[PDB]
């Protein structure tokens, strides 16, 4: 089953997506 | 400055290991002299600054004005100076919360941040100049005025 | 240990119970960490001799002023049971000054 990454990497991944775009 | 602070380290370390240089006998003599004097003068002890004090803001106003006198003549400000002026002007804006903070510091604060030192040279001797934490300066000044 | 388990189960069942909360800190909890149990009991607003339990804890800690203040609070209408008055009388008779 999957795992639930924490809010720190939530913010990090959102920042990666937005900077990428 | 380096040499004097090395000598000061020597003296403080010597005091720490040698304990007090004042004997209990002379300490008792001085203390009993003082208490006899105060009782002879009928001096009532200074009370703690109450929560409801009529002159509470007046002393705070004087302390803030005194702390700002060091910057009254100034053209350019460093970061620490800007933060200090911000602290005094904020305490002027909200006197009640600032005085509550001061009372809490006077009642339950015993650990303080390191205070910087330097020296001003008169070319005869050296006068030490101590820099104190900007927030604690306000409390110290209000205490001094009271 | 059986008494400790029973006290824990009783606390789990209707923790708002004044008598159980008051008699937990003083009986089951050791003098170390009793203050934490006292605070946990004080988390319940009602003080049916719970203030008396706080007074007993303060007296155990040998705090004369705190014990007197709590007993005065306990002897009020909050803990108006006669146990608080008897404890206040005993403490005043057992006070260091007894004036």
């Amino acid at each position: 089953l999957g795992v639930y990454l924490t809010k720190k990497e939530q913010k990090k991944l959102r920042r990666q997506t937005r900077r990428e775009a | 400055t380096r040499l004097y602070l090395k000598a000061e380290q020597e003296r403080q370390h010597n005091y720490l290991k040698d304990g007090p240089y004042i004997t209990a006998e002379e300490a008792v003599a001085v203390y009993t002299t003082t208490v006899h004097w105060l009782e002879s003068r009928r001096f009532s002890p200074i009370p703690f600054p109450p929560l409801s004090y009529k002159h509470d803001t007046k002393l705070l106003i004087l302390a803030l004005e005194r702390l700002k006198e060091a910057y009254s003549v100034k053209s350019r400000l460093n970061q620490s100076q800007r933060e200090e002026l911000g602290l005094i002007e904020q305490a002027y804006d909200n006197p009640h919360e600032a005085l509550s903070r001061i009372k809490r510091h006077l009642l339950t604060q015993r650990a303080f941040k390191e205070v910087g030192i330097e020296f001003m040279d008169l070319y005869s001797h050296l006068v030490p100049v101590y820099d104190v934490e900007p927030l604690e300066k306000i409390t110290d000044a209000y205490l001094d005025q009271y | 240990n059986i008494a400790n388990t029973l006290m824990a189960k009783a606390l789990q069942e209707c923790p708002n119970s004044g008598i159980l909360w008051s008699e937990a800190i003083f009986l089951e909890a050791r003098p170390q960490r009793r203050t934490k149990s006292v605070d946990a009991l004080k988390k319940c607003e009602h003080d049916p001799h719970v203030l008396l339990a706080v007074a007993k804890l303060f007296w155990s800690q040998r705090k004369i002023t705190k014990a007197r203040e709590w007993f005065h609070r306990t002897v009020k209408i909050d803990s108006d049971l006669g146990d608080a008055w008897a404890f206040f009388y005993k403490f005043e008779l057992q006070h260091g000054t007894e004036e």
């Binding site: 089953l1 795992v3 639930y4 990454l5 809010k7 | - | 400790n4 789990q12 960490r33």
Partner: protein, 124 residues
């Protein structure tokens, strides 16, 4: 499996529900991560149930938690990996013990009661 000293060890069916409850309590600020904080919650009597991991190699570092739960009549259950529990708790580091505390009028009361019921019928 890996550790025979695993009494309430749960399988891969209600583990998902347990981790969902852990995440929801994280969103509600309703858990205390770490063995020490779980022990403190058990001592304070406000812990409702604690979940630990059977991957901590010296399991006796956390084998006092089931005894403390037995003393306080608190449900307790194991999992199969410390990394999953840690990541579900809301922190990256592997966690070997977490606790779920109380809240007045909690929206998680029904699910936490269901989890308490599910664990309590799995001891044997």
């Amino acid at each position: 499996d890996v550790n025979p000293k695993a009494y309430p060890l749960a399988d891969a069916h209600l583990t998902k529900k347990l981790l969902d409850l852990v995440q929801q309590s994280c969103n509600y600020k309703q858990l205390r991560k770490g063995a020490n904080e779980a022990t403190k919650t058990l001592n304070r009597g406000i812990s409702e149930f604690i979940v630990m991991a059977a991957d901590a190699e010296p399991l006796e570092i956390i084998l006092h938690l089931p005894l403390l739960c037995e003393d306080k009549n608190v449900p307790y259950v194991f999992v199969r990996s410390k990394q999953a529990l840690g990541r579900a708790c809301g922190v990256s580091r592997p966690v070997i013990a977490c606790s779920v505390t109380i809240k007045e009028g909690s929206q998680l009361k029904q699910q936490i009661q269901s989890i308490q019921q599910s664990i309590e019928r799995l001891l044997v």
